[PDB]
Amino acid sequence: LLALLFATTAFLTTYWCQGTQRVPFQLRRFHTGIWYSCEEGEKCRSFIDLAPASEKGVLWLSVVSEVLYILLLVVGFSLMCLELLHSSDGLKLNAFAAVFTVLSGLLGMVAHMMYTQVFQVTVSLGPEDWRPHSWDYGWSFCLAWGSFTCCMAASVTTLNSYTK
Amino acid sequence: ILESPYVMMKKNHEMLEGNERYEGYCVDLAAEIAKHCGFKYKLTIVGDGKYGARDADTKIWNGMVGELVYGKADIAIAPLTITLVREEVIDFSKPFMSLGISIMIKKPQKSKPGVFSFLDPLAYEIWMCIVFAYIGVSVVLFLVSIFNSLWFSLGAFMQQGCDISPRSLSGRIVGGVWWFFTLIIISSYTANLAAFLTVERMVSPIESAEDLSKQTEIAYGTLDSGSTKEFFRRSKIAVFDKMWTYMRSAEPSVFVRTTAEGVARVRKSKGKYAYLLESTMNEYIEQRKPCDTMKVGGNLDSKGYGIATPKGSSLGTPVNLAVLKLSEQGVLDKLKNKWWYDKGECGAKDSGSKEKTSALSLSNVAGVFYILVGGLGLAMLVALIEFCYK
Amino acid sequence: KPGVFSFLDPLAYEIWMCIVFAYIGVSVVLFLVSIFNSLWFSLGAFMQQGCDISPRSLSGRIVGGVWWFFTLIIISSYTANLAAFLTVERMVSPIESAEDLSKQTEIAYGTLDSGSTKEFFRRSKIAVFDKMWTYMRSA
Amino acid sequence: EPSVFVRTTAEGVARVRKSKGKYAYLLESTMNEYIEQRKPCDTMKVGGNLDSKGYGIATPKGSSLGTPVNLAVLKLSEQGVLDKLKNKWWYDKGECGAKDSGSKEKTSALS
């Protein structure tokens, strides 16, 4: 559950990094999300799918790796709900429950690594008018990292039930 | 005509008066002709902004030629292309500035974001040859008596001292000889990798117009009007006429309206758009900041800027004495070092003295994740067919 | 010269985080042969020190070498970057002539806004100082 | 010291070849083009010209024949006959082909 909660918190990230163009111009404070770029006067825009043209093709593959991450988490619940259907073979599907949750986070780390590969390259462009003296990552992306080890701690104890 | 760095208006041109409002290469040069030929002068600007082109119907030369043919100007010290149709109407001096059509491209920039950057210190066929040498180890391991010991050739691949050892026969020898062979290569990899992080020379993409005549990955255009568009049309050389065939068949139009539009489209297409313009101006914009554009290759043709007097004026002959005098004195190149390098916004070798890069990027490491996850899919694909063996 | 932060210079801070977050993915794959034991043998296959438990010839033998193949590039690359640091660092020499400042532009240099010193580089017919005069005029 | 100035042009070209590249030499570009096309082609031209020079057709001073010559020279340049005969007498008539300049293989790694 907690691995699923901070999975969606990555999708519900309203601030991925601060965006600072505090140039002595004047002071500027962006708060770009993972997709939707908020800023502060207070205003929030999208600014999704930026340049160039094969990093966009990365962003095609990035969204696909995001969608496949959360859907494989649901399979871990549905087979363990079939355990409670039989608790109230069994051991094969509960082993299969941790199959897809492990195969969730393996693609999902690359889904996080493709977007850091995005955010490295886009700041390396110095984005069109918003290049920050930040690049303070997350804050939910450090918490989405904690969703990965909460997939892993859930997986080691249900294969421990497989050994018995 | 107001051209950089030839004739420009000063920052205090409203403060100054007369010829003192002007500045540039030709402004210094006209004072030199006024020094050697000894005459009072007035620097005047052409009205229509034309260099002088003959009409087709009324057959009227406009521009500075129309100021010299029609007597409106006494001499033309200006950047002016000596053409044959201009030769017959006004008398040119011998050319002080030889030039031609040159290749303006972007300066190259470090960007190799993935797997190909990982494979840099060891050549692609050597990646193939090291595996083709590795597979020769396999049956030699089975000559002691194959599928098991190939992992122990991988157990002897670099590190991780293996468990099966063919104790003291010939497999012990050659199993160490291949082991002796491969440890040279990982030291040599790290020696090559450290050198590549050390120097960082930026390799130029193209040299010749024959490079752009063949490739099409980087587009290239000229101005939408001019003798440059006329030249590749008039070029009977099959190299440039193919480039003329290229730019004619370039859809959308690589021909731009202003010169800075081509320079911007060099910068905006990130080096996928090259541009062709005259060498000394291609020198000049390469000196103008941000200096991300550069000139490669020589000129495609010999041209010449020459001082123009009206035809029949005897003043051009001591001018012709003065122009060859200033060239032999080297005043031209010295003012060229002034108005391109001293008055330019970059020192071209000063930034060449400024390249002291630093710490490792992540991008060269993340391309190797694809074959790393490709093993993780191979971890699943081999394991699932084991259930078919179950 | 500083402490812990100077140790972490050739490899970036998030890459220190990403290499551990890649390292933890090895762990359950080692347990897919059947976890707590073999994670030390992923540390046994971390750089060196050839490990004792080897999942002899199945997929754990493959990917256990693939991660092993992955990580040996990085200690070479950590050494290559650190050699790239120390090579350039020992090449950075202090300025020991005006001919050094006549060529480089990384460190600016000026004089007083008035004086014979401003007159001198103007009056200097030596192309070294006149370029420095050209530099400070174009500064 | 000793004198790098040589008596004949081929003596400088030989001293380029005999000193195994420890002796460079300075001469005019189109001839430096030319000897670079002459076999064994072990000499080559690097860099641009140090100065702008010019070969021009010379008539005696006061002869009116040079003026239609001046019409003809600009005509042949605009027609590109000069470069075409330059491709003839340096690259077609040269002892090494023009595309031999591209076989100078590049910065490839680890022989």
From Swiss-Prot, chain A:
| Record keyword Phosphoprotein present | yes
Keyword Amino-acid biosynthesis present in the record's keywords: the answer is no
- One Gene Ontology term from the biological process aspect of the record: synapse organization
What sections of the protein cross the membrane?
Answer: 1-13, 57-77, 95-115, 139-159
Extracellular compartment residues: 116-138
Location (main, coarse): membrane
One GO cellular component term of this record is:
glutamatergic synapse
UniProt keywords (A-Z) are: Cell membrane, Membrane, Phosphoprotein, Synapse, Transmembrane, Transmembrane helix
Protein's cellular compartments: Cell membrane; Synapse
Q: Which domain of life is it from?
A: Eukaryota
Kindly give the membrane topology term recorded for this protein: Multi-pass membrane protein
> Which segments does the topology annotation call Cytoplasmic?
78-94
Q: In which tissues is it expressed?
A: Expressed in the brain, including hippocampus (at protein level).
Q: Which family does it belong to?
A: Belongs to the GSG1 family.
Q: What function does this protein fulfil?
A: As a component of the inner core of AMPAR complexes, modifies AMPA receptor (AMPAR) gating.
Subunit composition and interactions: Component of the inner core of AMPAR complexes. AMPAR complexes consist of an inner core made of 4 pore-forming GluA/GRIA proteins (GRIA1, GRIA2, GRIA3 and GRIA4) and 4 major auxiliary subunits arranged in a twofold symmetry. One of the two pairs of distinct binding sites is occupied either by CNIH2, CNIH3 or CACNG2, CACNG3. The other harbors CACNG2, CACNG3, CACNG4, CACNG8 or GSG1L. This inner core of AMPAR complexes is complemented by outer core constituents binding directly to the GluA/GRIA proteins at sites distinct from the interaction sites of the inner core constituents.
Q: What is this protein called?
A: Germ cell-specific gene 1-like protein
Taxonomic classification, please?
Answer: Eukaryota, Metazoa, Chordata, Craniata, Vertebrata
UniProtKB/Swiss-Prot annotation, chain B:
- Site note Crucial to convey clamshell closure to channel opening applies to I206
For whether the record's keyword set contains Membrane, the answer is yes
Modification Phosphoserine occurs at: S235, S269
Name where it's found: Cell membrane; Postsynaptic cell membrane; Postsynaptic density membrane
Description of post-translational modifications: Palmitoylated. Depalmitoylated upon L-glutamate stimulation. Cys-162 palmitoylation leads to Golgi retention and decreased cell surface expression. In contrast, Cys-388 palmitoylation does not affect cell surface expression but regulates stimulation-dependent endocytosis.
What are the cysteine partners in each disulfide bond?
C291-C346
**Biological process GO annotation list?**
cellular response to amine stimulus; cellular response to brain-derived neurotrophic factor stimulus; cellular response to glycine; cerebral cortex development; chemical synaptic transmission; conditioned place preference; establishment of protein localization; ionotropic glutamate receptor signaling pathway
Intramembrane feature ranges: 146-159, 160-162
Residues carrying lipid (S-palmitoyl cysteine): C162, C388
The record places the following residue ranges in the Extracellular compartment, namely 190-364
Q: Which GO terms describe its cellular component?
A: AMPA glutamate receptor complex; asymmetric synapse; axon; cell surface; dendrite; dendrite cytoplasm; dendrite membrane; dendritic shaft
Assembly and interaction partners: Homotetramer or heterotetramer of pore-forming glutamate receptor subunits. Tetramers may be formed by the dimerization of dimers. May interact with MPP4. Forms a ternary complex with GRIP1 and CSPG4. Interacts with ATAD1 in an ATP-dependent manner. ATAD1-catalyzed ATP hydrolysis disrupts binding to ATAD1 and to GRIP1 and leads to AMPAR complex disassembly. Interacts with GRIP2. Interacts with GRIP1. Interacts with NSF via its C-terminus. Interacts with CACNG2, PICK1 and GRIP2. Interacts with GRIA1 and SYNDIG1. Part of a complex containing GRIA2, NSF and NAPA and/or NAPB.
The family classification in the record reads: Belongs to the glutamate-gated ion channel (TC 1.A.10.1) family. GRIA2 subfamily.
> What's this protein's name?
Glutamate receptor 2
Native source species: Rattus norvegicus (Rat)
- Span within the full-length protein is 421 to 838 of 883
From Swiss-Prot, chain D:
In chain numbering, where does the site feature Interaction with the cone snail toxin Con-ikot-ikot fall?
A: K75
Post-translationally, this protein is described as follows, namely: Palmitoylated. Depalmitoylated upon L-glutamate stimulation. Ubiquitinated by RNF167, leading to its degradation.
Disulfide pairs here are C41-C96
Q: Where are the Phosphoserine residues found in this chain? A: S19
Q: What induces it?
A: Down-regulated in the pyramidal cell layer of CA1 in the hippocampus by global ischemia.
* Domain notes per entry: The M4 transmembrane segment mediates tetramerization and is required for cell surface expression.
Q: What is this protein called?
A: Glutamate receptor 2
Organism listed in the record: Rattus norvegicus
Q: What is the lineage of its organism?
A: Eukaryota, Metazoa, Chordata, Craniata, Vertebrata
Its encoding gene is what?
Gria2
Full-protein positions shown: 699 to 809 of 883
